[PDB]
Each structure stands twice: as C-alpha cells, then as structure tokens.
C-alpha cells in the first residue's frame, strides 16, 4: 500500500543523477549509490579520487571477499576499471536486510565520477545479460531477491525541481523515492498502465507511436525502436534514433516557431534564457509516447510537457533568469527514455510479472494549463512488428 519507510530516500537531479544511500562492508561504510536501471554492476569507488568525498576501503571491511578477477566497463560516455569481490551490503532507508552482493571496487576510471554529483558508486538495476564481465556476476537486485523475501520488484519516483538547485540544495532536498519491493500509492495519481518488457537484459520496452502536440510523427514504428528502446534512469536526456530524433526536432521546432533559437540549443549544447518566471511553457509542444500494452492489439501512452524535456540549468552568469537546455538528443544505440522522461512518472519496475509500470508522478513539474499524463487504451495493431530483430 505504502512504504513510508523508503519514501524520499533519493537525492539529486536529472543532471548528475539520482542516488540513494547504502552501507558497504563491516563495519558499515556509508556511500551514496547512483541509481542506474541501465546497467547491472554494483561498482563503488574503492580509491581516492578528485571527485570522491569518501570511498570503499576493503582493507577496513572484515567481510570483504576477493575474487581475483578484474573488470573493464565502458559506458555510452565514460568507463571504469575495477577489481571484483564481495561484501555485506545494506540499504539504510530500505527493506531491513543485509545481503552479500558482488561489489566491483573501482580502482581506475576516466570521465565517470561526476564532479559535484555527490555519489561515489553506481547500482546497476538491470539484468545479468548486460553485467560485466559475463552474465554470471549476479546483479545486486537478484542477490537481494534470492537472499531475502523482498518481492522481486522495485519502483521509481524521480523528482526534478523544475528549477536549478545549488549543491547545498541538492544535499538538503528530496531528489525522489525508490521503493524497494513495493508500490507506494502516495507517489502517483491516475491509474497505472503497464507495457511488457521485451527481453530481460536491459529494461526494454517497445514504442508504437510518437506525437508532437498530437501530430503523429508518422514513422515506421520500427524506427522508434531501432536497435532498442530502454528505460534507463542513468541516462539524462531522452535519446532518440537519428532518423526519429531529426523528425522530432523538425516538429518541436515548427510548433515553437513563434520563437526561434540557435542550432546550438536544438543540439542539446547551449542553453536558452528567459526573464525570471516568464518561460513560454505554452509555445513548446507536449510529447506523447505510445507504449505497447499487455492486452493484444491494445496500447497506452505517456505524455510529457516541455517542463520535462527542457532541463533546468544555472544562469549563464548565475543571475535571475530561468534557463534550460533542450534535453532530447540523437542516439546511435536506439531509444533511451532517461531521467527526464522518468521525472514525469512513477515507474514500477515489476520484474516479477515481467512488465514496467507507468503512472503520473505525484511530483512532476507542470503549470495550471497542462499536466503530464498516462492515458489508455488504444486499439492499434501489429505492434510486435515495431520490434527490432
Ligand atoms: C555516470 C554515467 C557515466 C552513467 C551512464 N550514462 C551515460 O553514459 C550517459 C548516456 C546518455 O545518453 N545520457 C543523456 C544525457 C546526455 C547529456 C549531454 C552530455 O552527455 C555526455 O556526454 N556524457 C554523460 C554525462 C552524465 C556526463 C551522459 O549523459 N551519458 C550509464 O547510463 C551507462 C549506460 C547508458 C551504458 O552505456 N551501459 C552499458 C551498455 O549499454 N554498453 C553497451 C556498449 C558496448 C560496447 C561499446 C559501447 C557500448 C552496460 C554494459 C553497463
């Protein structure tokens, strides 16, 4: 019904990511672990580093176990190298349990640890399939479901402040909430629609239709799923395949033509500024992603406002304007429904019934004229075709 215990246990923003607190080893070594549903490794910093305020100190853990096996790991933008082992892990603000899970002690890394982010590790919530080195390194959530009773399911509620926050605010703020082994009704409104999980590797879903201000982008759906479509809390923007992305931008551009912006902006690089609280939320279009449903020939949709795709950043010269960056970029690796999009809903990663939940988050940013949404059902056909093989 509601797990008040775990509510608000997240912290951060779509920028650097939303992390949760965990203790590694004996005695407990508190560490803020970045919540990433797009990976499967549990890797914490295990050495001193420019951007780490504290790290994993095996020499001091009485239960640390060496596996004399290393691990290299590349990321769409980054990569770390570490030494595989095991230790006792616990989630302070989570189910009351202690589980032994594989911990990849990051000993060397390039462009991975974000400066200021405030998290020293990453929790790969995905499936073995994508784990490194091989699919035999039992992801953490599995160890958890195997060693305890905790239902095999977790939900996510990421909250974007809607405005830029300073490192002080981040710390003393409620990024979001990750409910371990349950669904807390207080985090969402409306019904909760479900889309099937294609293959249990990444958290893969299938998109069947895409609209901009209601105008069907009208593309062969496969293109939307080109390569694959995933729900990855570790990615910030809404990554879209070139052919699509390009169509999307042509639309978003056209719908906001009353105002023109530099190419830089549309290419997610530079920001756009507006006088304090005068941002034209209304001249920008809403994006509606149609996801496959569980009932044959039936689909539902999620709709986001520009308060989701226009990412808040600090003023060019930290003043009084309100600025953002277009947060939709092309992807050579398919579609990535990242942090932003997620910020618009309460997602139930129900691994058990192999399906992902989507509800309107009780904490998504909006105005009094438009609200995000999860509406359904819709009679569409041959959606299995939208799939990519
Ligand atoms: C802390 C951070 C480094 C975590 C990773 N995030 C990333 O790599 C994200 C992906 C993305 O599209 N974000 C959209 C916002 C763009 C903003 C503009 C700036 O973006 C950037 O240039 N870089 C970063 C930011 C955070 C600094 C970033 O955003 N990269 C994580 O999500 C990793 C995922 C995406 C990943 O790549 N997982 C592996 C994978 O899928 N690998 C496939 C592969 C195999 C062989 C070669 C290449 C890839 C898996 C095995 C663990």
Curated annotation (Swiss-Prot):
It is an enzyme of class 3 (hydrolase). It is found in: Cell membrane; Golgi apparatus, trans-Golgi network; Endoplasmic reticulum; Endosome. The modification N6-acetyllysine is found at residues 69, 218, 222, 228, 242-243, 250. It catalyses: Broad endopeptidase specificity. Cleaves Glu-Val-Asn-Leu-|-Asp-Ala-Glu-Phe in the Swedish variant of Alzheimer's amyloid precursor protein. Its EC number is 3.4.23.46. Induction: Up-regulated by the Ca(2+)-regulated transcription factor NFATC4. GO terms for biological process: amyloid fibril formation; amyloid precursor protein catabolic process; amyloid-beta formation; amyloid-beta metabolic process; cellular response to amyloid-beta; cellular response to copper ion; cellular response to manganese ion; detection of mechanical stimulus involved in sensory perception of pain. Its main location: membrane. Monomer. Interacts with RTN1; RTN2; RTN3 and RTN4; the interaction leads to inhibition of amyloid precursor protein processing. Interacts with SNX6. Interacts with PCSK9. Interacts with NAT8 and NAT8B. Interacts with BIN1. Interacts (via extracellular domain) with ADAM10 (via extracellular domain). Interacts with SORL1; this interaction may affect binding with APP and hence reduce APP cleavage. Interacts with NRDC AND NRG1. Belongs to the peptidase A1 family. Responsible for the proteolytic processing of the amyloid precursor protein (APP). Cleaves at the N-terminus of the A-beta peptide sequence, between residues 671 and 672 of APP, leads to the generation and extracellular release of beta-cleaved soluble APP, and a corresponding cell-associated C-terminal fragment which is later released by gamma-secretase. Cleaves CHL1. This is Beta-secretase 1. The gene is BACE1.
């Amino acid at each position: 019904g509601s797990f008040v215990e775990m509510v608000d246990n997240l912290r951060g923003k779509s920028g650097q990511g939303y992390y949760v607190e965990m203790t590694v080893g004996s005695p407990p070594q508190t560490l803020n672990i970045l919540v990433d549903t797009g990976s499967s490794n549990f890797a914490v910093g295990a050495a001193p580093h420019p951007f780490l305020h504290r790290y994993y100190q095996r020499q001091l853990s009485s239960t640390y176990r060496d596996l004399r096996k290393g691990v290299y790991v590349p990321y769409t933008q980054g990569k770390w190298e570490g030494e595989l082992g095991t230790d006792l892990v616990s989630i302070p603000h989570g189910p009351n349990v202690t589980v032994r899970a594989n911990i990849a002690a990051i000993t060397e890394s390039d462009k991975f640890f974000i400066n200021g982010s405030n998290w020293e590790g990453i929790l790969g919530l995905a499936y073995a399939e994508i784990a490194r080195p091989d699919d035999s390194l039992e992801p953490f959530f599995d160890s958890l479901v195997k060693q305890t009773h905790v239902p095999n399911l977790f939900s996510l509620q990421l909250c974007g402040a809607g405005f830029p926050l300073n490192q002080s605010e981040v710390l003393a703020s409620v990024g979001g909430s990750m409910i371990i082994g349950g669904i807390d009704h207080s985090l969402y409104t409306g019904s909760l629609w479900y889309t099937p999980i294609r293959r249990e590797w990444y958290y893969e879903v299938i998109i069947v239709r895409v609209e901009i201000n209601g105008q069907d982008l009208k593309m062969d759906c496969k293109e939307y799923n080109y390569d694959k479509s995933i729900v990855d809390s570790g990615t910030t923007n809404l990554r879209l395949p070139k052919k699509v992305f390009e169509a999307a931008v042509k639309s978003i551009k056209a719908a906001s033509s009353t105002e023109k912006f530099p190419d830089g902006f549309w290419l997610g690089e530079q920001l756009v500024c507006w006088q304090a609280g005068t941002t034209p939320w209304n001249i920008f279009p809403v994006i509606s992603l149609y996801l496959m449903g569980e009932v044959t020939n039936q689909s539902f949709r999620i709709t986001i406002l520009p308060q989701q795709y226009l990412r808040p950043v600090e003023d060019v010269a930290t003043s009084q304007d309100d600025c953002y960056k277009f947060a939709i970029s092309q992807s050579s690796t398919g579609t990535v429904m990242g942090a932003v999009i997620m910020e618009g809903f309460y997602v139930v990663f129900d691994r058990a019934r192999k399906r992902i939940g989507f509800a309107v988050s009780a904490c998504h940013v909006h105005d009094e004229f438009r609200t995000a949404a999860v509406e359904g059902p819709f009679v569409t056909l041959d959606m299995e075709d939208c799939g990519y093989n």
